[PDB]
Ligand binder design. Structure first.
Ligand SMILES: Nc1ncnc2c1ncn2[C@@H]1O[C@H](COP(=O)(O)OP(=O)(O)OP(=O)(O)O)[C@@H](O)[C@H]1O
Ligand SMILES: [Mg+2]
Lengths: 437, 437
RNA sequence: GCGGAUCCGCAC
RNA sequence: GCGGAUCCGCACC
RNA sequence: GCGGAUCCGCACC
RNA sequence: CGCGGAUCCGCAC
């Protein structure tokens, strides 16, 4: 009962406390003071500026507004100077407009140069767009900032908050547009129960329609899909979650889950009872950001899954896990072992030249005719999915992601049986197999 | 060695001696005296009437001519009454067209009733062309009767003589048409090396052309394919044999092959080396004619084969064996065991009604979303191909042929391992698996 | 009987 | 996956 | 200025 | 293969 009581308690988990707020205001005031000493033009943007930031995620964003006549090189050099001059400690990121990330009075700060611009139609960067996003949202989001926080909390608790490749979920900007459109958490959730994979939500035009894909129209740029990196399966998960929530609302939807964590002996028994082949490809993690690594782990998994398909090991699902030192690609197959013998297709009976060649190979068994065509019994190179993947991975490393493939080329290990359960992959195995807690 | 030395030596084991000719001659006159006494129209046809029957395969075809104003009932009654009166001892065993099969002074005789007809179109019985085949062949075949016998011997020795369902090979009539068309064995064999699955041989127009299938046009009826029941694989086998024969001619081509005959222990070790599941379905032979039986064993084998494919046991080949008392359906599969768990497909995420129903079923493991669609891990009833077929044959007996299925319903047994290698099916197993000498 | 085509039913 | 029907084709010569 | 990856499109009948 | 686009990123040469 009392969805309202639940949302009241959910806000406690999600609204920054008075101390975190004070710390942000003090950093902001100081930052303004330092910027104003330099005579510079600037805007505070983002979640801090709109008071929509989540408990524990305090960060200030300052965009430095330069004349459009300035060159990109001038933008970088001027901006980097001002950033470095205005922060307690600092560090430089990005290329194009490189920006300065640092601290002011314990608070994380981003100082970003961009062109000022009168109109949204003069955008030659994503960061040129950010001030327009803010300008569109400030004043439309006032009074609803806690609705935004509820939505962000709901998504974060369920592992689908963030558009970055590791998550492929809902961006903070997206969450704010949805609150502007529907007017609250709860109305978003009620309506989302009827979203489809062809739903188009058009903020600026004040409408919903049907399209080719799930598409949230950026009110600052009609050709841009704010939900571009929201995966189909995460869209599906959110819609399912919204239907569950309205059927039986609970504070549990806003609390992050903590893994099953079961004995390796119970896990051994589960795998035994399923009768499947369960194994991992272990290799050293490439030294690359998550946004490069995760799509490559997705590719590697997919390629090996497809190899297992072709070689008739009948894979069920794949999964992956990246630790700080190693990466793991996990597979479960319905076939533990396949026959040594297989059938190799030959030519039609009427192709004399190639029939003679086909029949000339020395084989343990006699070729045979079936349905007008010659076939031969030949011997497989590998007989288990573990052995098959060892071969594919050593041979086709190059197709398994640029950096992941190069890592596998240097070293990989195939792990199965009881040795796999001692690896730090138990939560992924459980989820992949649908183990009830 | 050398074709013409071989063919002269081949004629010895193919041309019947006087001893056998006299018994046929004596039998035909004794038969002729009995038919003349009754005063019924009769015609001698087939290989005996044209002196093209194979050594040690003497049989005499006599055709009773009836008017078209009789009907199929009277045709049957009066035709069988005559054959029984005319023969020493008789059997009445046929699939459709009535005829008496018996003996006259130690010689096989078939007494077949048919209609007279002005011309061999719009036929009434099914054997009504045979008197027209005889008229077409007597005269054209004179001087070529030993060439026919060579061809029949070549085919019989290689298990592909006869158009009956047990063989699905070349008929005697087809052999005679080919020798008339090409002029000889050797020329048939030479030209057969370039037959394809779209080769049309039109004897009446004296030409070969391309069609939709392998078609030997009946000079008596241009709509009739004399090779209708020659299977694609036996055509291929023939074409292959002619190529081999012309590259290295041998008298072995005209001699029957002895069975492979090997010890159950070698047979066991071969199966272990192949890594396959080998098993048989044993049931009692229905009391029916071969021309109904063999097609039904083919269907039953095909249905079970297709079951094994669907259930992901990856069958390699099948075969069958009919003995006096029992029939056997043989299978070799690449998968000896499959996991208990499999994937059941559920609805798309949008389809709330069906998602709810799908998600409400009790299961050991949690359902999951994949590519916009719900899936569940469920549990197989069986986990080996033998267990699968036990289920399928107990439950789908009715679809395994009319008589064959009805027998399988009253009793069947699945046999594998050591106990299979004692069943009288070693020859068929060896042929299935391509076992060498 | 078996197969092909065409239709009808049931189970998806 | 199965269960009927009809027409045609094929085997039994 | 550039740089990185992943997915898609395009060209090669 | 490469080129181009989209997406999520980074300091790049
Ligand atoms: N499947 C068939 N196709 C065409 N004609 C057939 C067929 N079966 C029988 N006949 C006709 O009936 C005749 C006798 O049939 P039969 O089965 O006795 O073969 P055959 O020609 O006598 O050769 P043999 O008896 O030596 O095997 C044939 O010559 C033929 O004209
Ligand atoms: Mg005969």
């Amino acid at each position: 009962m009392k969805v309202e009581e639940i949302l009241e308690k959910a806000l406690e988990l999600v609204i920054p406390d008075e101390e975190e707020v004070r710390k942000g205001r003090e950093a902001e005031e100081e930052l303004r003071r330092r910027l104003d000493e330099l005579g510079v033009e600037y805007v505070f943007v983002g979640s801090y500026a709109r008071n929509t930031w989540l408990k524990g995620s305090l960060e200030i964003d300052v965009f430095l507004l330069f004349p459009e006549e300035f060159s990109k090189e001038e933008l970088r050099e001027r901006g980097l100077e001002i950033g470095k001059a205005v922060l307690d400690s600092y560090e430089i990121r990005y290329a194009e407009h490189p920006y300065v990330h640092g601290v002011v009075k314990g608070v994380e700060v981003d100082v970003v140069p961009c062109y000022k611009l009168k109109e949204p139609k003069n955008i030659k960067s994503a960061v040129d767009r950010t001030p327009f996003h803010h300008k569109w949202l400030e004043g439309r989001i006032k009074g609803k900032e806690n609705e935004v926080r509820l939505l962000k909390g709901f998504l974060k608790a369920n592992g689908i908050y963030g558009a970055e490749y590791k998550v492929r979920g809902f961006s903070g900007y997206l969450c704010e547009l949805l609150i502007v459109f529907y007017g609250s958490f709860l109305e978003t959730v009620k309506n989302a129960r009827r979203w489809t994979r062809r739903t188009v939500i058009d903020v600026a035009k004040g409408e919903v329609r049907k399209g080719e894909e799930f598409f949230v129209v950026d009110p600052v740029d009609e050709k841009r899909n704010v939900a571009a990196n929201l995966s189909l399966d995460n869209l599906a998960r959110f819609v399912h979650l919204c239907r569950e929530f309205m059927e039986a609302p609970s504070l549990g939807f806003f609390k992050p889950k903590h893994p099953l964590e079961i004995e390796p002996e119970r896990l051994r028994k589960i795998v035994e009872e399923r009768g499947t082949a369960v194994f991992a490809v272990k290799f050293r993690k490439p030294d690359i950001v998550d946004d490069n690594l995760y799509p490559q782990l997705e590719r590697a998994s997919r390629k090996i899954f497809e190899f297992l398909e072709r070689e008739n090991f009948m894979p069920l699902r794949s999964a992956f896990k990246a630790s700080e030192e190693f990466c793991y690609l996990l597979f479960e197959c319905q076939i533990k072992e396949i026959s040594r013998v297989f059938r190799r297709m030959g030519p039609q009976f009427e192709d004399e030249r190639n029939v003679k060649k086909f029949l000339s190979r020395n084989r343990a068994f006699r070729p045979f005719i079936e349905n007008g065509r010659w076939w031969a019994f030949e011997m497989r190179k590998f007989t288990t999915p573990e052995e098959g993947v060892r071969s594919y991975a050593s041979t086709h490393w190059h197709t398994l992601g640029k950096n992941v493939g190069e890592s596998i080329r240097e070293y990989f290990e195939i792990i199965s049986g009881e040795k796999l359960f001692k690896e730090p992959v138990t939560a992924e195995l459980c989820e992949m197999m649908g183990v009830k807690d």
